[PDB]
Amino acid sequence: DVVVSRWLRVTVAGGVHISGLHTESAPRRQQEQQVPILEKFCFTPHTEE
Amino acid sequence: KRAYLQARFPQLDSTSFANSRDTSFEQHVLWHTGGKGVDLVLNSLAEE
Numbered sequence: 001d002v003v004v005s006r007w008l009r010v011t012v013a014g015g016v017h018i019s020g021l022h023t024e025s026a027p028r029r030q031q032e033q034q035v036p037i038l039e040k041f042c043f044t045p046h047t048e049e
Numbered sequence: 050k051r052a053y054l055q056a057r058f059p060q061l062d063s064t065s066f067a068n069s070r071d072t073s074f075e076q077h078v079l080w081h082t083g084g085k086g087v088d089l090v091l092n093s094l095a096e097e
Contacts (some may be wrong), residue, residue: 007084008076 072097 002013011018051066064081067074078087 008079 069094 002011004011009020011021054066055061067077
């Protein structure tokens with residue numbers, strides 16, 4: 001079992017006890033992100049002048 | 050000392066005391082203040 005106490009800032013789970021965890025924001029910037037192909041579905045007449 | 054203080058200042062409650070010999074007062078204060086903590090801390094203790 002694990003209990004997280006934000007008021008006291010303690011995480012206890014079994015035989016471990018973390019006190020005073022601090023986490024900083026990461027850039028979250030991954031190179032070569034997805035490049036989705038964007039299209040438009042439209043009616044094209046058979047004969048166009 | 051707890052009993053003497055309770056006798057001296059009746060306004061104090063059973064939730065206004067904590068143990069000094071150990072570091073248990075941090076959890077008590079944080080719990081009874083909702084994690085907000087206190088404003089002034091008149092400190093005379095050392096090390097941890």
